[PDB]
RNA sequence: GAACCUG
Protein backbone atom coordinates (compact mmCIF):
# COMPACT_ATOMS: atom_id res chain seq x y z
CA UNK A 1 0.00 0.00 0.00
CA UNK A 2 0.96 3.71 0.23
CA UNK A 3 1.68 4.23 -3.48
CA UNK A 4 3.13 7.67 -4.24
CA UNK A 5 1.91 9.94 -7.07
CA UNK A 6 5.22 9.55 -8.92
CA UNK A 7 4.73 5.78 -8.79
CA UNK A 8 1.20 6.26 -10.13
CA UNK A 9 2.66 8.33 -12.99
CA UNK A 10 5.29 5.67 -13.75
CA UNK A 11 2.71 2.90 -14.11
CA UNK A 12 0.59 5.03 -16.47
CA UNK A 13 3.74 6.03 -18.36
CA UNK A 14 4.80 2.39 -18.92
CA UNK A 15 1.33 1.24 -19.99
CA UNK A 16 1.38 3.73 -22.88
CA UNK A 17 1.55 2.62 -26.51
CA UNK A 18 4.28 4.03 -28.78
CA UNK A 19 2.05 6.53 -30.63
CA UNK A 20 0.72 7.75 -27.27
CA UNK A 21 4.21 7.87 -25.74
CA UNK A 22 5.67 10.10 -28.48
CA UNK A 23 2.71 12.48 -28.16
CA UNK A 24 2.89 12.63 -24.36
CA UNK A 25 6.65 13.05 -23.89
CA UNK A 26 6.65 16.40 -25.70
CA UNK A 27 3.15 17.65 -24.84
CA UNK A 28 3.37 21.20 -23.44
CA UNK A 29 7.12 21.24 -22.76
CA UNK A 30 9.63 23.83 -23.95
CA UNK A 31 12.14 22.75 -26.58
CA UNK A 32 15.28 24.21 -28.16
CA UNK A 33 15.56 24.36 -31.97
CA UNK A 34 18.48 22.16 -33.03
CA UNK A 35 18.11 21.87 -36.84
CA UNK A 36 20.57 24.75 -37.37
CA UNK A 37 23.20 23.28 -35.02
CA UNK A 38 22.78 19.63 -36.10
CA UNK A 39 23.63 20.45 -39.72
CA UNK A 40 26.68 22.48 -38.68
CA UNK A 41 28.14 19.59 -36.70
CA UNK A 42 27.71 17.15 -39.61
CA UNK A 43 29.42 19.73 -41.83
CA UNK A 44 32.25 19.65 -39.26
CA UNK A 45 32.00 23.17 -37.82
CA UNK A 46 33.47 23.71 -34.34
CA UNK A 47 32.31 27.27 -33.57
CA UNK A 48 29.02 28.88 -32.42
CA UNK A 49 27.05 25.61 -32.15
CA UNK A 50 26.15 23.95 -28.87
CA UNK A 51 27.20 20.29 -28.84
CA UNK A 52 23.87 19.05 -27.40
CA UNK A 53 20.55 20.11 -25.81
CA UNK A 54 22.47 20.14 -22.50
CA UNK A 55 23.94 23.63 -22.94
CA UNK A 56 20.47 25.20 -23.15
CA UNK A 57 19.38 23.10 -20.18
CA UNK A 58 22.17 24.36 -17.90
CA UNK A 59 21.67 27.95 -19.09
CA UNK A 60 18.09 27.87 -17.77
CA UNK A 61 19.40 27.40 -14.21
CA UNK A 62 22.22 29.92 -14.69
CA UNK A 63 19.89 32.66 -16.03
CA UNK A 64 17.95 32.28 -12.77
CA UNK A 65 21.06 32.35 -10.54
CA UNK A 66 20.28 28.84 -9.25
CA UNK A 67 23.83 27.79 -10.09
CA UNK A 68 26.68 30.30 -10.31
CA UNK A 69 29.63 28.60 -12.08
CA UNK A 70 32.95 29.95 -10.73
CA UNK A 71 36.62 29.07 -11.07
CA UNK A 72 37.22 25.33 -11.24
CA UNK A 73 34.21 23.53 -12.74
CA UNK A 74 34.15 19.74 -12.43
CA UNK A 75 31.53 18.05 -14.60
CA UNK A 76 30.63 14.43 -13.75
CA UNK A 77 29.14 12.51 -16.69
CA UNK A 78 30.01 15.16 -19.27
CA UNK A 79 29.17 13.04 -22.35
CA UNK A 80 29.50 15.00 -25.59
CA UNK A 81 30.38 18.10 -23.50
CA UNK A 82 27.31 20.39 -23.56
CA UNK A 83 27.59 21.59 -19.96
CA UNK A 84 31.37 21.93 -20.11
CA UNK A 85 31.52 24.06 -23.27
CA UNK A 86 28.73 26.26 -21.94
CA UNK A 87 30.60 26.99 -18.67
CA UNK A 88 33.77 27.80 -20.64
CA UNK A 89 32.10 30.98 -21.94
CA UNK A 90 31.18 32.33 -18.48
CA UNK A 91 33.33 35.14 -17.01
CA UNK A 92 33.76 33.72 -13.48
CA UNK A 93 34.93 30.28 -14.68
CA UNK A 94 38.71 29.70 -14.81
CA UNK A 95 38.95 25.99 -15.78
CA UNK A 96 36.70 23.06 -16.71
CA UNK A 97 37.43 19.35 -16.13
CA UNK A 98 34.86 16.93 -17.56
CA UNK A 99 34.75 13.18 -16.91
CA UNK A 100 32.62 10.62 -18.78
CA UNK A 101 32.15 6.84 -19.13
CA UNK A 102 32.44 6.49 -22.90
CA UNK A 103 32.69 3.10 -24.59
CA UNK A 104 30.41 1.53 -27.24
CA UNK A 105 26.80 2.78 -27.20
CA UNK A 106 27.72 5.64 -24.87
CA UNK A 107 28.41 9.26 -25.70
CA UNK A 108 31.98 10.35 -26.44
CA UNK A 109 33.34 13.92 -25.91
CA UNK A 110 33.43 16.16 -28.99
CA UNK A 111 36.36 18.51 -29.72
CA UNK A 112 35.05 22.06 -30.14
CA UNK A 113 36.50 25.55 -30.50
CA UNK A 114 33.66 27.63 -29.04
CA UNK A 115 34.42 30.59 -26.76
CA UNK A 116 36.66 29.33 -23.94
CA UNK A 117 37.53 25.91 -25.39
CA UNK A 118 41.17 26.16 -24.26
CA UNK A 119 40.35 25.98 -20.54
CA UNK A 120 38.42 22.74 -21.16
CA UNK A 121 39.76 19.20 -20.73
CA UNK A 122 37.30 16.35 -21.32
CA UNK A 123 38.58 12.86 -20.56
CA UNK A 124 36.65 9.72 -21.51
CA UNK A 125 36.80 6.10 -20.29
CA UNK A 126 36.33 7.09 -16.65
CA UNK A 127 33.82 5.50 -14.30
CA UNK A 128 32.93 8.40 -11.98
CA UNK A 129 32.13 6.01 -9.10
CA UNK A 130 35.90 5.35 -8.80
CA UNK A 131 37.21 8.87 -9.39
CA UNK A 132 38.81 10.21 -6.18
CA UNK A 133 37.05 13.50 -5.26
CA UNK A 134 39.02 16.71 -5.83
CA UNK A 135 38.64 20.27 -4.56
CA UNK A 136 36.54 22.33 -6.98
CA UNK A 137 34.53 25.58 -6.97
CA UNK A 138 31.51 24.15 -8.80
CA UNK A 139 30.33 20.54 -9.13
CA UNK A 140 28.12 19.54 -12.06
CA UNK A 141 26.57 16.06 -12.37
CA UNK A 142 24.11 14.68 -14.92
CA UNK A 143 24.46 10.93 -14.28
CA UNK A 144 21.49 8.53 -13.89
CA UNK A 145 19.93 6.05 -16.33
CA UNK A 146 16.15 5.58 -16.66
CA UNK A 147 14.40 2.29 -15.99
CA UNK A 148 10.77 1.21 -16.37
CA UNK A 149 11.27 -0.03 -12.79
CA UNK A 150 11.13 2.76 -10.21
CA UNK A 151 12.90 0.57 -7.63
CA UNK A 152 15.80 0.03 -10.06
CA UNK A 153 15.81 3.80 -10.64
CA UNK A 154 15.70 4.32 -6.85
CA UNK A 155 18.94 2.44 -6.20
CA UNK A 156 20.67 4.09 -9.16
CA UNK A 157 19.84 7.57 -7.88
CA UNK A 158 20.88 6.72 -4.31
CA UNK A 159 24.21 5.47 -5.71
CA UNK A 160 24.72 8.87 -7.41
CA UNK A 161 23.85 10.78 -4.21
CA UNK A 162 26.38 8.64 -2.33
CA UNK A 163 29.26 9.31 -4.77
CA UNK A 164 28.34 12.98 -5.25
CA UNK A 165 28.35 13.73 -1.49
CA UNK A 166 32.14 13.81 -0.82
CA UNK A 167 32.63 16.27 -3.72
CA UNK A 168 30.56 18.97 -1.99
CA UNK A 169 32.22 21.25 0.56
CA UNK A 170 31.90 25.02 -0.07
CA UNK A 171 30.77 25.08 -3.66
CA UNK A 172 28.08 25.70 -6.23
CA UNK A 173 26.40 22.57 -7.55
CA UNK A 174 23.78 21.27 -9.94
CA UNK A 175 23.11 17.55 -9.64
CA UNK A 176 20.55 15.44 -11.52
CA UNK A 177 18.24 13.44 -9.29
CA UNK A 178 16.86 10.80 -11.67
CA UNK A 179 14.01 9.61 -9.46
CA UNK A 180 13.07 11.92 -6.59
CA UNK A 181 9.60 10.53 -5.76
CA UNK A 182 10.67 7.17 -4.28
CA UNK A 183 10.54 7.10 -0.43
CA UNK A 184 14.19 6.17 0.19
CA UNK A 185 15.42 8.82 -2.26
CA UNK A 186 13.40 11.43 -0.36
CA UNK A 187 15.07 10.45 2.94
CA UNK A 188 18.55 10.91 1.49
CA UNK A 189 17.67 14.22 -0.16
CA UNK A 190 16.30 15.46 3.16
CA UNK A 191 19.52 14.53 4.99
CA UNK A 192 21.51 16.05 2.12
CA UNK A 193 19.62 19.37 2.07
CA UNK A 194 20.17 19.70 5.82
CA UNK A 195 23.92 19.42 5.31
CA UNK A 196 24.68 21.21 2.00
CA UNK A 197 21.54 23.33 1.47
CA UNK A 198 19.95 24.01 -1.91
CA UNK A 199 16.63 23.05 -3.49
CA UNK A 200 15.17 20.60 -6.01
CA UNK A 201 13.96 22.24 -9.24
CA UNK A 202 12.05 21.12 -12.36
CA UNK A 203 13.60 22.11 -15.69
CA UNK A 204 10.97 23.10 -18.34
CA UNK A 205 13.17 21.59 -21.08
CA UNK A 206 12.89 18.17 -19.44
CA UNK A 207 10.48 15.85 -21.23
CA UNK A 208 7.26 14.55 -19.66
CA UNK A 209 8.70 11.02 -19.92
CA UNK A 210 11.19 11.66 -17.10
CA UNK A 211 10.62 12.67 -13.48
CA UNK A 212 14.06 14.34 -13.54
CA UNK A 213 14.75 17.09 -11.04
CA UNK A 214 17.95 19.00 -10.31
CA UNK A 215 19.50 19.60 -6.92
CA UNK A 216 20.54 23.24 -7.18
CA UNK A 217 22.83 25.04 -4.70
CA UNK A 218 21.19 28.50 -4.58
CA UNK A 219 17.64 28.05 -3.36
CA UNK A 220 15.58 26.83 -0.43
CA UNK A 221 12.24 25.14 0.31
CA UNK A 222 10.17 22.00 0.80
CA UNK A 223 11.54 19.23 -1.42
CA UNK A 224 8.71 16.80 -0.64
CA UNK A 225 5.97 19.14 -1.91
CA UNK A 226 7.96 20.44 -4.90
CA UNK A 227 8.42 16.77 -5.91
CA UNK A 228 4.67 16.11 -5.51
CA UNK A 229 3.91 19.18 -7.62
CA UNK A 230 5.96 17.77 -10.48
CA UNK A 231 4.00 14.52 -10.10
CA UNK A 232 0.61 16.27 -10.36
CA UNK A 233 1.86 18.40 -13.27
CA UNK A 234 2.97 15.31 -15.23
CA UNK A 235 -0.15 13.30 -14.33
CA UNK A 236 -2.32 16.18 -15.55
CA UNK A 237 -0.52 16.13 -18.91
CA UNK A 238 -2.01 12.68 -19.68
CA UNK A 239 -5.64 13.91 -19.78
CA UNK A 240 -4.78 17.37 -21.14
CA UNK A 241 -5.30 17.60 -24.91
CA UNK A 242 -1.97 17.45 -26.76
CA UNK A 243 -0.07 20.76 -26.97
CA UNK A 244 2.84 21.55 -29.30
CA UNK A 245 6.20 22.14 -27.59
CA UNK A 246 7.19 25.79 -27.10
CA UNK A 247 10.13 26.30 -29.46
CA UNK A 248 13.02 28.55 -28.37
CA UNK A 249 16.28 29.43 -30.13
CA UNK A 250 19.45 27.49 -29.25
CA UNK A 251 22.48 28.84 -27.39
CA UNK A 252 25.19 30.68 -29.34
CA UNK A 253 28.48 29.71 -27.67
CA UNK A 254 30.63 31.89 -29.96
CA UNK A 255 34.31 31.40 -30.81
CA UNK A 256 37.86 32.15 -29.63
CA UNK A 257 40.15 31.52 -26.66
CA UNK A 258 40.43 32.78 -23.05
CA UNK A 259 43.11 33.66 -20.45
CA UNK B 1 20.48 -2.20 -4.62
CA UNK B 2 19.23 -5.47 -6.14
CA UNK B 3 15.95 -6.62 -7.77
CA UNK B 4 13.45 -9.05 -6.18
CA UNK B 5 14.14 -11.68 -8.84
CA UNK B 6 17.88 -11.35 -8.18
CA UNK B 7 17.20 -11.98 -4.49
CA UNK B 8 15.24 -15.11 -5.45
CA UNK B 9 18.12 -16.44 -7.57
CA UNK B 10 20.67 -16.06 -4.75
CA UNK B 11 18.39 -18.04 -2.44
CA UNK B 12 17.65 -20.65 -5.12
CA UNK B 13 21.40 -21.14 -5.63
CA UNK B 14 22.07 -21.58 -1.89
CA UNK B 15 19.88 -24.66 -1.41
CA UNK B 16 20.73 -28.28 -0.56
CA UNK B 17 19.66 -30.91 -3.13
CA UNK B 18 16.99 -32.09 -0.64
CA UNK B 19 15.53 -28.56 -0.29
CA UNK B 20 15.85 -27.81 -4.01
CA UNK B 21 13.98 -31.02 -4.86
CA UNK B 22 11.23 -30.10 -2.39
CA UNK B 23 11.02 -26.45 -3.51
CA UNK B 24 10.93 -26.83 -7.30
CA UNK B 25 7.52 -28.54 -7.38
CA UNK B 26 6.00 -27.09 -4.18
CA UNK B 27 2.48 -25.79 -4.83
CA UNK B 28 2.65 -25.98 -8.64
CA UNK B 29 0.14 -27.51 -11.03
CA UNK B 30 1.36 -30.58 -12.93
CA UNK B 31 0.08 -32.75 -15.77
CA UNK B 32 -0.06 -36.54 -15.30
CA UNK B 33 2.18 -38.18 -17.90
CA UNK B 34 2.26 -41.87 -16.83
CA UNK B 35 -0.50 -42.69 -19.36
CA UNK B 36 1.18 -40.97 -22.32
CA UNK B 37 4.80 -41.99 -21.57
CA UNK B 38 3.91 -45.70 -21.74
CA UNK B 39 2.02 -45.32 -25.04
CA UNK B 40 4.99 -43.58 -26.64
CA UNK B 41 7.45 -46.32 -25.55
CA UNK B 42 4.89 -48.84 -26.82
CA UNK B 43 5.04 -47.05 -30.20
CA UNK B 44 1.56 -45.47 -30.44
CA UNK B 45 1.20 -42.29 -32.51
CA UNK B 46 -2.37 -41.16 -31.74
CA UNK B 47 -4.13 -39.43 -28.79
CA UNK B 48 -0.95 -38.85 -26.78
CA UNK B 49 0.78 -35.51 -26.38
CA UNK B 50 4.48 -35.72 -27.25
CA UNK B 51 5.57 -33.65 -24.21
CA UNK B 52 4.26 -31.59 -21.27
CA UNK B 53 4.40 -28.65 -23.70
CA UNK B 54 1.00 -29.38 -25.22
CA UNK B 55 -0.68 -28.79 -21.86
CA UNK B 56 1.44 -25.71 -21.25
CA UNK B 57 0.28 -24.04 -24.47
CA UNK B 58 -3.34 -25.01 -23.86
CA UNK B 59 -3.26 -22.99 -20.62
CA UNK B 60 -2.75 -19.80 -22.67
CA UNK B 61 -5.16 -20.80 -25.45
CA UNK B 62 -7.96 -21.58 -22.93
CA UNK B 63 -7.57 -18.01 -21.67
CA UNK B 64 -7.53 -16.27 -25.09
CA UNK B 65 -3.97 -15.09 -24.43
CA UNK B 66 -2.74 -16.61 -27.70
CA UNK B 67 -5.15 -17.35 -30.53
CA UNK B 68 -3.31 -19.58 -33.05
CA UNK B 69 -4.51 -18.84 -36.62
CA UNK B 70 -3.62 -19.71 -40.23
CA UNK B 71 0.13 -20.11 -40.63
CA UNK B 72 1.75 -21.03 -37.30
CA UNK B 73 5.53 -20.82 -37.00
CA UNK B 74 7.04 -22.49 -33.94
CA UNK B 75 10.67 -21.58 -33.15
CA UNK B 76 12.43 -24.24 -31.05
CA UNK B 77 9.71 -26.85 -31.47
CA UNK B 78 11.76 -29.74 -30.03
CA UNK B 79 9.76 -32.99 -29.88
CA UNK B 80 6.75 -31.18 -31.38
CA UNK B 81 4.51 -30.48 -28.36
CA UNK B 82 3.32 -27.01 -29.34
CA UNK B 83 3.13 -27.80 -33.05
CA UNK B 84 0.89 -30.86 -32.72
CA UNK B 85 -1.44 -29.09 -30.29
CA UNK B 86 -1.98 -26.19 -32.72
CA UNK B 87 -2.55 -28.60 -35.61
CA UNK B 88 -5.86 -29.61 -34.00
CA UNK B 89 -7.14 -26.03 -33.61
CA UNK B 90 -9.97 -24.77 -35.84
CA UNK B 91 -8.35 -21.56 -37.11
CA UNK B 92 -4.88 -23.00 -37.84
CA UNK B 93 -4.20 -23.89 -41.51
CA UNK B 94 -0.49 -24.85 -41.47
CA UNK B 95 2.23 -25.42 -38.86
CA UNK B 96 5.98 -25.06 -39.41
CA UNK B 97 8.27 -26.13 -36.56
CA UNK B 98 12.01 -25.45 -36.46
CA UNK B 99 14.44 -26.93 -33.95
CA UNK B 100 18.16 -27.37 -33.26
CA UNK B 101 18.43 -31.16 -32.99
CA UNK B 102 21.77 -32.97 -32.94
CA UNK B 103 23.16 -35.19 -30.15
CA UNK B 104 21.84 -34.42 -26.65
CA UNK B 105 19.13 -32.18 -28.10
CA UNK B 106 15.47 -33.07 -28.59
CA UNK B 107 14.57 -34.44 -32.03
CA UNK B 108 11.07 -34.02 -33.61
CA UNK B 109 8.75 -37.01 -33.14
CA UNK B 110 6.48 -38.23 -35.99
CA UNK B 111 2.86 -38.37 -34.83
CA UNK B 112 -0.58 -38.99 -36.30
CA UNK B 113 -2.69 -36.98 -33.86
CA UNK B 114 -5.49 -34.81 -35.25
CA UNK B 115 -4.15 -32.48 -37.95
CA UNK B 116 -0.71 -34.11 -38.31
CA UNK B 117 -0.87 -33.65 -42.08
CA UNK B 118 -0.63 -29.84 -41.92
CA UNK B 119 2.50 -30.03 -39.73
CA UNK B 120 6.10 -29.98 -40.97
CA UNK B 121 8.89 -30.17 -38.41
CA UNK B 122 12.47 -29.65 -39.61
CA UNK B 123 15.42 -30.41 -37.36
CA UNK B 124 19.02 -29.24 -37.77
CA UNK B 125 17.95 -25.60 -37.82
CA UNK B 126 19.62 -22.92 -35.67
CA UNK B 127 16.86 -20.35 -35.42
CA UNK B 128 19.16 -17.30 -35.04
CA UNK B 129 20.04 -17.80 -38.72
CA UNK B 130 16.55 -18.55 -40.05
CA UNK B 131 15.40 -15.67 -42.29
CA UNK B 132 12.09 -14.24 -40.97
CA UNK B 133 8.97 -15.06 -42.97
CA UNK B 134 5.38 -13.83 -43.00
CA UNK B 135 3.16 -15.82 -40.61
CA UNK B 136 -0.14 -15.44 -38.76
CA UNK B 137 1.14 -16.67 -35.39
CA UNK B 138 4.65 -16.88 -33.93
CA UNK B 139 5.51 -19.33 -31.15
CA UNK B 140 8.87 -19.41 -29.41
CA UNK B 141 10.03 -21.56 -26.48
CA UNK B 142 13.82 -21.06 -26.77
CA UNK B 143 15.90 -20.15 -23.69
CA UNK B 144 18.27 -22.22 -21.52
CA UNK B 145 18.63 -21.72 -17.75
CA UNK B 146 21.89 -20.80 -16.00
CA UNK B 147 22.79 -20.41 -12.31
CA UNK B 148 24.24 -17.04 -13.36
CA UNK B 149 21.48 -14.42 -13.83
CA UNK B 150 23.73 -12.22 -16.03
CA UNK B 151 24.30 -15.21 -18.35
CA UNK B 152 20.53 -15.83 -18.55
CA UNK B 153 20.14 -12.08 -19.14
CA UNK B 154 22.22 -12.05 -22.33
CA UNK B 155 20.65 -15.32 -23.56
CA UNK B 156 17.21 -13.80 -23.03
CA UNK B 157 18.12 -10.54 -24.86
CA UNK B 158 19.54 -12.45 -27.83
CA UNK B 159 16.22 -14.32 -28.13
CA UNK B 160 14.26 -11.06 -27.92
CA UNK B 161 16.39 -9.54 -30.68
CA UNK B 162 15.88 -12.47 -33.10
CA UNK B 163 12.18 -12.83 -32.38
CA UNK B 164 11.39 -9.14 -33.04
CA UNK B 165 11.58 -9.08 -36.88
CA UNK B 166 9.10 -12.00 -36.97
CA UNK B 167 6.37 -9.85 -35.33
CA UNK B 168 4.08 -7.71 -37.49
CA UNK B 169 0.30 -8.27 -37.34
CA UNK B 170 0.29 -11.63 -35.64
CA UNK B 171 -0.52 -13.61 -32.54
CA UNK B 172 2.52 -14.53 -30.47
CA UNK B 173 3.66 -16.48 -27.43
CA UNK B 174 7.35 -16.01 -26.64
CA UNK B 175 9.24 -17.51 -23.71
CA UNK B 176 11.15 -14.89 -21.73
CA UNK B 177 13.66 -16.86 -19.65
CA UNK B 178 14.83 -14.10 -17.32
CA UNK B 179 12.48 -11.11 -17.05
CA UNK B 180 13.66 -9.64 -13.74
CA UNK B 181 17.13 -8.40 -14.77
CA UNK B 182 17.36 -4.58 -15.31
CA UNK B 183 18.35 -4.50 -19.02
CA UNK B 184 15.78 -7.17 -19.95
CA UNK B 185 13.14 -4.89 -18.40
CA UNK B 186 14.30 -2.02 -20.64
CA UNK B 187 14.02 -4.21 -23.74
CA UNK B 188 10.64 -5.73 -22.86
CA UNK B 189 9.31 -2.21 -22.31
CA UNK B 190 10.42 -1.02 -25.76
CA UNK B 191 8.93 -4.18 -27.28
CA UNK B 192 5.53 -3.90 -25.59
CA UNK B 193 5.45 -0.29 -26.77
CA UNK B 194 5.87 -1.54 -30.36
CA UNK B 195 3.99 -4.83 -30.45
CA UNK B 196 1.74 -4.63 -27.38
CA UNK B 197 0.97 -7.73 -25.34
CA UNK B 198 1.74 -8.71 -21.75
CA UNK B 199 3.96 -10.96 -19.60
CA UNK B 200 2.31 -13.95 -17.94
CA UNK B 201 3.23 -16.70 -15.48
CA UNK B 202 2.25 -20.23 -16.41
CA UNK B 203 1.25 -22.32 -13.31
CA UNK B 204 2.79 -25.41 -14.95
CA UNK B 205 6.23 -23.78 -14.67
CA UNK B 206 8.50 -25.07 -11.89
CA UNK B 207 9.56 -22.88 -8.96
CA UNK B 208 13.22 -23.17 -10.02
CA UNK B 209 12.61 -21.03 -13.13
CA UNK B 210 11.47 -17.39 -13.25
CA UNK B 211 10.13 -18.14 -16.76
CA UNK B 212 7.48 -15.82 -18.14
CA UNK B 213 5.68 -15.66 -21.48
CA UNK B 214 5.21 -12.60 -23.63
CA UNK B 215 1.76 -13.06 -25.16
CA UNK B 216 -0.05 -10.96 -27.76
CA UNK B 217 -3.55 -10.65 -26.28
CA UNK B 218 -3.12 -8.67 -23.09
CA UNK B 219 -1.95 -5.43 -21.53
CA UNK B 220 -0.41 -4.26 -18.27
CA UNK B 221 2.64 -2.98 -16.42
CA UNK B 222 5.37 -5.59 -16.99
CA UNK B 223 7.37 -4.27 -14.02
CA UNK B 224 4.61 -5.07 -11.53
CA UNK B 225 3.68 -8.39 -13.15
CA UNK B 226 7.32 -9.57 -13.05
CA UNK B 227 7.52 -8.47 -9.40
CA UNK B 228 4.42 -10.45 -8.39
CA UNK B 229 6.06 -13.64 -9.64
CA UNK B 230 9.20 -12.76 -7.64
CA UNK B 231 7.17 -12.34 -4.44
CA UNK B 232 5.26 -15.52 -5.27
CA UNK B 233 8.45 -17.55 -5.70
CA UNK B 234 10.06 -15.93 -2.63
CA UNK B 235 7.04 -16.84 -0.50
CA UNK B 236 7.29 -20.49 -1.55
CA UNK B 237 10.67 -20.75 0.22
CA UNK B 238 9.20 -20.34 3.72
CA UNK B 239 5.76 -21.86 3.01
CA UNK B 240 5.45 -25.49 4.17
CA UNK B 241 5.83 -27.97 1.29
CA UNK B 242 2.70 -28.56 -0.79
CA UNK B 243 2.03 -31.46 -3.15
CA UNK B 244 1.64 -30.51 -6.82
CA UNK B 245 -1.93 -30.24 -8.15
CA UNK B 246 -2.15 -33.07 -10.69
CA UNK B 247 -4.30 -32.49 -13.78
CA UNK B 248 -5.17 -34.77 -16.69
CA UNK B 249 -3.08 -34.54 -19.88
CA UNK B 250 -4.33 -33.31 -23.26
CA UNK B 251 -6.05 -35.79 -25.59
CA UNK B 252 -4.98 -34.76 -29.10
CA UNK B 253 -7.07 -37.36 -30.95
CA UNK B 254 -6.43 -38.78 -34.42
CA UNK B 255 -7.08 -38.23 -38.14
CA UNK B 256 -6.27 -35.78 -40.93
CA UNK B 257 -7.46 -32.28 -41.93
CA UNK B 258 -8.28 -30.11 -44.98
C1' G C 1 28.11 -22.85 -12.51
C1' A C 2 33.00 -28.33 -13.42
C1' A C 3 41.32 -26.91 -14.95
C1' C C 4 40.31 -27.90 -9.63
C1' C C 5 37.31 -27.94 -4.42
C1' U C 6 32.21 -27.53 -1.54
C1' G C 7 27.49 -26.67 -2.07
N1 LIG D 1 29.49 6.12 -13.89
C1 LIG D 1 29.62 6.97 -14.84
N2 LIG D 1 30.75 7.59 -14.95
C2 LIG D 1 30.92 8.45 -15.89
N3 LIG D 1 29.99 8.71 -16.74
C3 LIG D 1 28.84 8.11 -16.68
C4 LIG D 1 28.63 7.22 -15.71
N4 LIG D 1 27.42 6.78 -15.87
C5 LIG D 1 26.90 7.39 -16.90
N5 LIG D 1 27.78 8.21 -17.40
C6 LIG D 1 27.68 9.07 -18.52
O1 LIG D 1 26.93 10.12 -18.08
C7 LIG D 1 26.66 10.83 -19.20
C8 LIG D 1 25.58 11.71 -18.70
S1 LIG D 1 24.59 12.54 -20.06
C9 LIG D 1 25.41 13.98 -20.50
C10 LIG D 1 25.01 15.26 -20.85
C11 LIG D 1 25.50 16.16 -20.94
N6 LIG D 1 25.31 16.86 -19.67
C12 LIG D 1 25.40 17.09 -22.10
O2 LIG D 1 25.15 18.28 -22.17
O3 LIG D 1 25.65 16.74 -23.18
C13 LIG D 1 26.12 9.77 -20.09
O4 LIG D 1 26.61 10.04 -21.37
C14 LIG D 1 26.82 8.53 -19.62
O5 LIG D 1 27.64 8.15 -20.69
N1 LIG E 1 18.92 -21.64 -31.29
C1 LIG E 1 18.07 -22.60 -31.47
N2 LIG E 1 17.57 -22.84 -32.64
C2 LIG E 1 16.71 -23.79 -32.80
N3 LIG E 1 16.33 -24.53 -31.82
C3 LIG E 1 16.79 -24.31 -30.62
C4 LIG E 1 17.67 -23.33 -30.42
N4 LIG E 1 17.99 -23.32 -29.17
C5 LIG E 1 17.31 -24.27 -28.59
N5 LIG E 1 16.59 -24.88 -29.48
C6 LIG E 1 15.71 -25.96 -29.22
O1 LIG E 1 14.71 -25.26 -28.66
C7 LIG E 1 13.96 -26.14 -27.93
C8 LIG E 1 13.22 -25.49 -26.78
S1 LIG E 1 12.34 -26.63 -25.39
C9 LIG E 1 11.15 -27.27 -26.50
C10 LIG E 1 9.75 -27.53 -25.87
C11 LIG E 1 8.63 -27.60 -26.81
N6 LIG E 1 7.95 -26.28 -26.80
C12 LIG E 1 7.68 -28.73 -26.53
O2 LIG E 1 6.51 -28.53 -26.34
O3 LIG E 1 8.05 -29.83 -26.54
C13 LIG E 1 14.93 -27.16 -27.47
O4 LIG E 1 14.66 -28.28 -28.21
C14 LIG E 1 16.21 -26.71 -28.05
O5 LIG E 1 16.76 -27.91 -28.52
Residue numbers in the entry:
A (entry chain D): 5 to 263
B (entry chain B): 6 to 263
Paper text:
The NS5 protein is a 103 kDa protein consisting of an N-terminal S-adenosyl-L-methionine (SAM)-dependent methyltransferase (MTase) and a C-terminal RNA-dependent RNA polymerase (RdRp). (3) The NS5 MTase transfers a methyl group to the N7 position of the guanine moiety forming a cap 0 structure (7meGpppA-RNA). (4) The NS5 MTase catalyzes methylation at the ribose 2′-O position of adenosine resulting in formation of the cap 1 structure (7meGpppA2′-O-me-RNA). After each methylation event, SAM is converted to the by-product S-adenosyl-L-homocysteine (SAH).
To start addressing the molecular basis for the interactions between the flavivirus MTase and longer capped RNA substrates, we solved the X-ray crystal structure of DENV-3 MTase in complex with a 5′-capped octameric RNA at 2.9 Å resolution. Four MTase monomers assemble into a ring structure that encircles the two RNA octamers around a 2-fold non-crystallographic symmetry (ncs) axis, whilst the other two monomers make no contact with RNA, but participate in protein-protein interactions. The cap moiety occupies the GTP binding pocket while the remaining of the RNA chain makes minimal interactions with the protein and appears stabilized by intra-molecular interactions as described in the next section. Base G0 is sandwiched between Phe25 of the MTase GTP binding site and base A1. In addition, residues Lys14, Leu17, Leu20 and Asn18 together with several water molecules make interactions with the G0pppA1 moiety. Interestingly, our structure shows that despite adopting a similar conformation, the path of the RNA chain at the 3′-OH of A1 is not affected by Pro152. The RNA octamers contain no complementary sequences and stabilizing interactions between RNA molecules I and II arise through the formation of intra and intermolecular base stackings and non-canonical base-pairs, resulting in the formation of ‘kissing’ loops. The atomic distance between the methyl donor in the SAM binding pocket and the N7 acceptor of G0 is about 16 Å in our structure. Our structure does not represent a catalytically-competent complex for either the N7 or 2′-O methylation. One possibility is that this crystal structure mimics the initial docking of the 5′-capped viral genomic RNA to the MTase at the GTP binding site prior to the N7 and 2′-O methylation events.
